[PDB]
Design an enzyme around this catalytic site. Structure first.
Site, PDB file in Angstrom:
ATOM      1  N   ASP A  95      -2.441  -7.392 -11.527  1.00 23.67           N
ATOM      2  CA  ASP A  95      -3.347  -6.782 -12.485  1.00 23.67           C
ATOM      3  C   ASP A  95      -2.977  -7.200 -13.908  1.00 23.67           C
ATOM      4  OD1 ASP A  95      -5.418  -5.207 -13.436  1.00 23.67           O
ATOM      5  OD2 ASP A  95      -4.845  -3.460 -12.232  1.00 23.67           O
ATOM      6  N   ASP A 149      -9.600  -6.351 -19.251  1.00 21.69           N
ATOM      7  CA  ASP A 149     -10.952  -5.889 -19.519  1.00 21.69           C
ATOM      8  C   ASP A 149     -10.920  -4.527 -20.197  1.00 21.69           C
ATOM      9  OD1 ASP A 149      -9.984  -4.523 -17.351  1.00 21.69           O
ATOM     10  OD2 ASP A 149     -11.758  -4.781 -16.089  1.00 21.69           O
ATOM     11  N   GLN A 192     -18.312  -5.957 -15.599  1.00 24.06           N
ATOM     12  CA  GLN A 192     -18.401  -4.606 -16.121  1.00 24.06           C
ATOM     13  C   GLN A 192     -19.862  -4.148 -16.116  1.00 24.06           C
ATOM     14  OE1 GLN A 192     -15.705  -2.420 -17.548  1.00 24.06           O
ATOM     15  NE2 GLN A 192     -14.707  -3.693 -15.990  1.00 24.06           N
ATOM     16  N   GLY A 219     -15.290  -1.214 -12.249  1.00 29.09           N
ATOM     17  CA  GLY A 219     -15.939  -0.012 -12.728  1.00 29.09           C
ATOM     18  C   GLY A 219     -16.648   0.813 -11.680  1.00 29.09           C
ATOM     19  N   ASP A 269      -8.980  -3.622  -2.414  1.00 26.44           N
ATOM     20  CA  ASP A 269      -7.692  -2.970  -2.598  1.00 26.44           C
ATOM     21  C   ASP A 269      -7.924  -1.485  -2.836  1.00 26.44           C
ATOM     22  OD1 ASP A 269      -6.701  -1.949  -5.475  1.00 26.44           O
ATOM     23  OD2 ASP A 269      -8.143  -3.570  -5.795  1.00 26.44           O
ATOM     24  N   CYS A 307      -3.711  -0.265  18.778  1.00 27.52           N
ATOM     25  CA  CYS A 307      -3.034  -0.696  17.563  1.00 27.52           C
ATOM     26  C   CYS A 307      -1.745  -1.438  17.894  1.00 27.52           C
ATOM     27  CB  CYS A 307      -2.730   0.508  16.671  1.00 27.52           C
ATOM     28  SG  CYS A 307      -1.933   0.089  15.108  1.00 27.52           S
ATOM     29  N   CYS A 309       0.677  -2.079  15.558  1.00 21.10           N
ATOM     30  CA  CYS A 309       1.689  -1.814  14.548  1.00 21.10           C
ATOM     31  C   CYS A 309       2.964  -1.261  15.185  1.00 21.10           C
ATOM     32  CB  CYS A 309       1.155  -0.831  13.510  1.00 21.10           C
ATOM     33  SG  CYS A 309       1.481   0.899  13.883  1.00 21.10           S
ATOM     34  N   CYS A 312       2.993   2.409  16.520  1.00 21.16           N
ATOM     35  CA  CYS A 312       2.351   2.606  17.811  1.00 21.16           C
ATOM     36  C   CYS A 312       3.090   1.922  18.953  1.00 21.16           C
ATOM     37  CB  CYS A 312       0.904   2.112  17.758  1.00 21.16           C
ATOM     38  SG  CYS A 312      -0.160   3.096  16.677  1.00 21.16           S
ATOM     39  N   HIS A 338       1.305   2.381   9.861  1.00 22.49           N
ATOM     40  CA  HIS A 338       0.135   2.323  10.732  1.00 22.49           C
ATOM     41  C   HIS A 338      -1.154   2.206   9.929  1.00 22.49           C
ATOM     42  CE1 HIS A 338      -2.804   3.425  13.827  1.00 22.49           C
ATOM     43  NE2 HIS A 338      -3.262   4.297  12.947  1.00 22.49           N
TER      44      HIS A 338
HETATM   45 ZN   LIG Z   1      -0.429   1.876  14.726  1.00 24.89          ZN
END
Ligand SMILES: [Zn+2]
Ligand SMILES: [Br-]
Ligand SMILES: [Cl-]
Ligand SMILES: [Cl-]
Ligand SMILES: [Cl-]
Ligand SMILES: [Cl-]
Ligand SMILES: [Cl-]
Ligand SMILES: [K+]
Length: 393
Positions: A95, A149, A192, A219, A269, A307, A309, A312, A338
């Site tokens: 940023d 900005d 913007q 925005g 994001d 899942c 991950c 899990c 997760h």
């Molecule tokens: Zn998971």
């Protein structure tokens, strides 16, 4: 005479504006559409960059605002830049530091020269100009750097919105001129205009005249109406170039991601997965599991049997239900891993459906699992999907 393009379109949906593509950045290729987690470890509660790497994340957000003695972006004086500081071998999006300065301090003032802040203890003034914002980003060496900005609240109305929109155009040109290393870093512009259709159209027409590698939609994370939200997104993507990435900042809800992919967005994001975990909640295709509730006390299945991950693979719902009440900190970490993997797997599944020419059918499956039957989808998302040719059955 055109600058090299960082994005390659692999497949485009024949009905909606959904795009499957690849980002070719200095630290490797990134598959799009992509959700980008925060790699910055400014939080005691969070996920390490080594775990983000294990989850398959190939681009994350990183900023230095939280470091140093004063507010604002900070130089780290590291030989390997922000990549070495974060131990991150992949892509970084950084940023400008301006949004955090005007939002968190609330004692900052915005002039044409930049963002100003008087110190709380002694009154020493820190000025964040477009020149200073880019000089810091050049030293950090991040793969994608954001324009500084003039950010206004989407709810605030009046000439202030138009004032910030024109100031963001003037600051965009200042950032371009001050940007060394365009061979290593990609400067994105930020559209913007607030919720005004004519102001954003002016910003879209003017900012797309510059040959920056990518464009962002700014925005719109504010608390506006969902109707105004999807309309400004569709308006932006309708006038942004298709041969360049579209970054919609601040959107993380699963439904908002699928709709905005259908509207033509490529990058997202949001700290939504982290905040969801702190309520003891785990993201699933049907929404979220409130694991503190005692229906999971003797539920020994994983959060999601589909899942991949680590949470899990190793832990059950019952273990997390007890952990949320005996060690709330450790349970927050497991849910954070997760919820971030769910976002990664959701974006990966969206991309696969676009490549396999079944994105409209994917959206119906997603809405049916999320809301029971696709016709129970919220009205705002039905309007947004139908505006690009996706009806719900
Ligand atoms: Zn998971
Ligand atoms: Br490049
Ligand atoms: Cl995140
Ligand atoms: Cl540039
Ligand atoms: Cl219950
Ligand atoms: Cl167990
Ligand atoms: Cl398709
Ligand atoms: K700082």
């Amino acid at each position: 005479e055109s600058a090299p393009r960082i994005m390659r379109l692999v497949a485009e949906c024949s009905r909606s504006r959904a795009r499957a593509g690849e980002l070719w950045l200095p630290h490797g290729t990134v598959a799009t559409p992509v959700f980008m987690p925060v790699g910055t470890q400014a939080t005691m509660k969070g996920i390490t960059t080594e775990q983000l790497d294990a989850l398959g994340c190939r681009i994350c957000l990183g900023n230095t605002y939280h470091l140093g003695l004063r507010p604002g972006p900070e130089l780290i004086q590291k030989a390997n830049g922000l990549h070495g500081f974060m131990n991150w071998p992949h892509n970084l999006l950084t940023d400008s530091g301006g949004f955090q300065m005007v939002s968190l301090v609330s004692l900052s003032e915005v002039t044409e020269e930049g963002v100003r802040f008087r110190s709380p203890y002694d009154g020493n003034e820190t000025l964040l100009s477009p020149e200073k914002s880019v000089q810091i980003q050049n030293a950090l060496g991040s793969d994608i750097i954001m324009q500084l900005d003039d950010v206004v609240s989407s709810t605030v109305t009046g000439p202030r919105v138009e004032e910030a929109m024109y100031r963001s155009i003037r600051w965009l040109d200042r950032c371009i001129a001050a940007h060394q290393r365009p061979d290593k870093q990609n400067l994105f512009a930020i559209i913007q205009g607030g919720l005004d259709a004519d102001l954003r159209a002016t910003c879209l027409e003017e900012m797309t005249k510059r040959d920056v590698p990518g464009f962002a939609i700014g925005g719109l994370s504010g608390g506006e109406s969902k109707s105004q939200f999807w309309r400004m997104v569709a308006l932006s993507t309708s006038r942004l170039p298709k041969d360049k990435p579209r970054y919609l900042m601040g959107v993380g809800y699963a439904t908002d991601l699928v709709v905005c992919v259908a509207l033509g967005c490529d990058m997202f994001d949001c700290v939504f997965p982290t905040r969801t975990a702190r309520f003891g909640s785990a993201l699933v295709p049907t929404g979220n599991l409130q694991l503190r509730k005692k229906v999971f006390e003797k539920d020994f299945g994983p959060i999601d049997p589909e899942c991949t991950c680590p949470t899990c693979q190793k832990h059950s719902r019952a273990f997390l239900h007890a952990l949320l009440h005996s060690d709330n900190t450790a349970a927050l970490h497991h849910l954070t891993v997760h919820n971030i993997a769910y976002q990664l797997q959701l974006m990966s599944a969206v991309r696969t459906s676009i490549v396999e020419k079944r994105f409209p059918d994917f959206v119906r499956d997603f809405m049916g699992a999320m809301y029971g039957d696709p016709t129970l989808c919220p009205t705002w998302a039905t309007d947004a999907l139908a505006s690009v040719g996706i009806t719900l059955g």
